[PDB]
Amino acid sequence: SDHKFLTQAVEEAYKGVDCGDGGPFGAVIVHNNEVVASCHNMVLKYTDPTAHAEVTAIREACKKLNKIELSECEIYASCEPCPMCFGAIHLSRLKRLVYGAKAEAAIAIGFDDFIADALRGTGVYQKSSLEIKKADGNGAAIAEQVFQNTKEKFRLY
Amino acid sequence: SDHKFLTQAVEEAYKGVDCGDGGPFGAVIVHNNEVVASCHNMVLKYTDPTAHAEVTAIREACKKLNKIELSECEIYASCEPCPMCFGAIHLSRLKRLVYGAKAEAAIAIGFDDFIADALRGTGVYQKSSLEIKKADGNGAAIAEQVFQNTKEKFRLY
Numbered sequence A, B: 001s002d003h004k005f006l007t008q009a010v011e012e013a014y015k016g017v018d019c020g021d022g023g024p025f026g027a028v029i030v031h032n033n034e035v036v037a038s039c040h041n042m043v044l045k046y047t048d049p050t051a052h053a054e055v056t057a058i059r060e061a062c063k064k065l066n067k068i069e070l071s072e073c074e075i076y077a078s079c080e081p082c083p084m085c086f087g088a089i090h091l092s093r094l095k096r097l098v099y100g101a102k103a104e105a106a107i108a109i110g111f112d113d114f115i116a117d118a119l120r121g122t123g124v125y126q127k128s129s130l131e132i133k134k135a136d137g138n139g140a141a142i143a144e145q146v147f148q149n150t151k152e153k154f155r156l157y
């Protein structure tokens, strides 16, 4: 079931960049194989630098489920979450994170060098414990290729 | 001018607790010496765990200025910004952060141990550029007192 929802997140990334909402990033929040939220980056559409795909998905999932904790939910991100988005995932109490592409694939097309220490386990003060899965194989290749595929379709931010 | 805006952020923390919007946290974003945003934690009001005071102030300031970058603005936080909030401050490109109380003051009254390595200078993958000032003396006393004064007047989250 991981492949299906990572796929959906990647397609959200493509859709968001095509409609000009924001960058090529998508996020799907799922509750026991029920899609609670399906979102992409909305920084340009919302004039909001915090409206990454993961944060937008968290906001919509929490509003839909009428609670601020998503402890029985899981989040699929097309890209390895940034420090802000990983902090948001922590605060949301999401129990599992699956992500598609390494941050380096997004950095390679000119995005900021902005990587979450707590995700990679390189912090002194911030330590994470939530289950984290980096996809491999098919979905990982597709998720990594998103950035080369969308390079000329949007302005960097 | 720092003490005035830090005190306004602390005041926002008190207001947000009093009307039940969220926890005892405030944030004020100013452009030179004009307040562009004045906010407190809105997690309970919005059913949004990302609605910390700093994130809320960033979103409202970006709406007021009609742009996604705040490089000419500074932010005053009643409490040391969390990993999510410090990451949002990085993305928003605010040029200066002044914060009131160390995170340990909020941990002492029941909030999670959730500290930003990049703020304290122990980050490996996240390196910040912005000027950071920890208040001392009266501003620190006020910001720290926030937590003793409100310690059981709000619902923890």
Ligand SMILES: Nc1ncnc2c1ncn2[C@@H]1O[C@H](CO)[C@@H](O)[C@H]1O
Residues within 6 Å of the ligand: A023, A025, A026, A040, A041, A051, A052, A053, A054, A079, A080, A081, A082, A085, A103, A106, A107, A111, A112, A113, A114, B091
């Ligand atoms: N919705 C988004 N989701 C993930 N990363 C994003 C997003 N928007 C911009 N980025 C940037 O992509 C890079 C790789 O994570 C970082 O510089 C980060 O700020």
Ligand SMILES: Nc1ncnc2c1ncn2[C@@H]1O[C@H](CO)[C@@H](O)[C@H]1O
Residues within 6 Å of the ligand: B023, B025, B026, B040, B041, B042, B051, B052, B053, B054, B079, B080, B081, B082, B085, B103, B106, B107, B111, B112, B113, B114
């Ligand atoms: N609006 C807020 N602003 C800053 N810290 C907050 C806020 N709400 C909750 N906290 C928590 O306070 C603690 C100290 O930073 C952390 O656990 C953090 O998540």
Ligand SMILES: [Zn+2]
Residues within 6 Å of the ligand: A052, A054, A081, A082, A083, A084, A085, A086
């Ligand atoms: Zn992010």
Ligand SMILES: [Zn+2]
Residues within 6 Å of the ligand: B052, B053, B054, B081, B082, B083, B084, B085, B086
């Ligand atoms: Zn925060």
